[PDB]
């Protein structure tokens, strides 16, 4: 598991990738095709919240659901 | 949430 202490041990310029590395497989389970885009969207969130989402499945799911609805709305807006 | 975000590529 990724912890606050582990994340702080990393070079600051690496911290988002450490999060993305752990977030992606879970998001890909939920959304196999679009996981890469969704992970990119969530990585904009603050690291503390991302750490919480990594260890709370309900929290991750609800943010992923939001990301998907925003992506779909944007698809209609670009159309 | 920003739908223009850069796509993640996993290692």
Listed by start position, the domains of chain A span: 3-75
Cβ burial A37-50 (10 Å sphere, 16+ → b, else e): bbbbbbbebebeeb
What is the interface size between A and B, counted as CB pairs within 8 Å?
A: 41
CATH homologous superfamily of A3-75 equals c-terminal domain of poly(a) binding protein (1.10.1900.10)
Q: Which residues of A touch B3 (CB under 8 A)?
A: 37, 41, 70-71, 73-74
The alpha carbon dihedral of A36, B7, A53, A1 has a sign of positive
Q: Burial, A19: exposed, middle or buried (Cβ in 10 Å; 0-12, 13-18, 19+)?
A: buried
Report d(CA A36, CA A3) in Å as an integer.
Answer: 23
Say whether A56 sits in a helix, a strand or coil: coil
Task: Kindly provide the resolution of this structure in angstroms, with one decimal.
Answer: 1.8
């Amino acid at each position: 598991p990724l912890t606050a202490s582990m994340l702080a041990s990393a070079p600051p310029q690496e911290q988002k990738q450490m999060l993305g590395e752990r977030l992606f497989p879970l998001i890909q389970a939920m959304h196999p095709t679009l996981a890469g885009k969704i992970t990119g969207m969530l990585l904009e969130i603050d690291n503390s919240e991302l750490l919480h989402m990594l260890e709370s499945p309900e929290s991750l799911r609800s943010k992923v659901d939001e990301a998907v609805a925003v992506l779909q709305a944007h698809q209609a807006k670009e159309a | 949430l920003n739908p223009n975000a850069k796509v993640w590529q996993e290692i």
